[PDB]
Design a protein around this ligand. Structure first.
Ligand code: S04
Ligand code: NAG
Ligand code: NA
Ligand code: NA
Lengths: 28, 251, 11
């Protein structure tokens, strides 16, 4: 609920996965 | 998933595998939206043209998985189903309109590094992100090609396509309860969902709050990864009132 | 094709 969509091994540790930047770059 | 890559560990901790009890086999993808609720495509459970009509006791959900075929001891969790809910206006006869179903687990699942729920979009996040050109991410253990199967969970990022282009790519009647995604023939890159990826999530990472939202459910495609075709996804936000009604009534 | 899962989940 309150914690939805924040991945323990990524967002919760401020680590990025290898392709999430591709998504961000498309959000113009 | 066609033309994707191996997922990283914990990359999609909301990923769920719908598993047939007998014979033991992959049925579909699905997603974890709370400790007790799993979201999938209606056609994963009910599709009369193929004599498909599963009941709760026919199925298991496997959560926290990476490997397709291995039993991932100490990592995955396997849950029984308490109840299936299919959208009352799911159109299996024509075009898979409103291709959405909820599954309530018999017991809550424990979250972990590998198991964690995805957010469902609010109206504002949907309006902001569901735009042509914006990319989402599709994951699953389905086939690697139309006509083979992956060792581990596959991932592919795909752009949302303009509605008129979606409409002009098919003879199927498209509805507001669907959106389509994929690269155009002239774009070079490719990728698609395929058989077995049904019911899995199309997610987007909000640049406003850095959370992942499930915008779509893998629904249908004419073949897999064909030039000039696109993948069609259930529009989760458009059907959110139904989701909420079910969870409020049976939660 | 799939590794057997613990019998407890089938009972
Ligand atoms: N086809 C794989 C696929 C590709 C992309 C996406 Cl997003 C999902 C999927 C998975 N979904 C499916 O496979 C679903 C399950 C029932 C029929 N189906 C399909 O996609 C059908 C098309 C649906 C459209 C809506 C009405 C019912 C038929 N294509 S199909 O299985 O590949 C059969 C097909 C092959 C080649 C040309 C045309 C059709
Ligand atoms: C599917 O299964 C349910 C329960 O057994 C049944 O009531 C229904 O008539 C079947 N066919 C459908 C929903 O098309
Ligand atoms: Na058309
Ligand atoms: Na295509």
């Amino acid at each position: 609920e309150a914690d939805c969509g924040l991945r323990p091994l990524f967002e919760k540790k401020s680590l990025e996965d290898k392709t999430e930047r591709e998504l961000l770059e498309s959000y113009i | 998933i066609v033309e994707g890559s191996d997922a990283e560990i914990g990359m999609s901790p909301w990923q769920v595998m719908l598993f047939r009890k007998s014979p033991q086999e992959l049925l579909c993808g699905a997603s974890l939206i709370s400790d007790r609720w799993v979201l999938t495509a209606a056609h994963c459970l009910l599709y009369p043209p193929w004599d498909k009509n599963f009941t709760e006791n026919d199925l298991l959900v496997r959560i926290g998985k990476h490997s397709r075929t291995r039993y991932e001891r100490n990592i995955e969790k396997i849950s029984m189903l308490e109840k299936i809910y299919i959208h009352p206006r799911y159109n299996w006869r024509e075009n898979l309109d409103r291709d959405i179903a909820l599954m309530k687990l018999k017991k809550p699942v424990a979250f972990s590094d590998y198991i964690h729920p995805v957010c469902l979009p609010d109206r504002e996040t949907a309006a902001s992100l569901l735009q042509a050109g914006y990319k989402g991410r599709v994951t699953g253990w389905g086939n690697l090609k139309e006509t083979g199967q992956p060792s581990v969970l596959q991932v592919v990022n795909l752009p949302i396509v303009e509605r008129p282009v979606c409409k002009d790519s098919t003879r199927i009647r498209i509805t507001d309860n669907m959106f389509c995604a994929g690269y155009k023939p002239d774009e070079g890159k490719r990728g698609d969902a395929c058989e077995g990826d049904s019911g899995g999530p199309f997610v987007m990472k909000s640049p406003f709050n850095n959370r992942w939202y499930q915008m779509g459910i893998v629904s249908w495609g004419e073949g897999c990864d064909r030039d000039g075709k696109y993948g069609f996804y259930t529009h989760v936000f458009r059907l959110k009132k139904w989701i909420q009604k079910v969870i409020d009534q049976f939660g | 094709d799939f590794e057997e899962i613990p019998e407890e989940y089938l009972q």
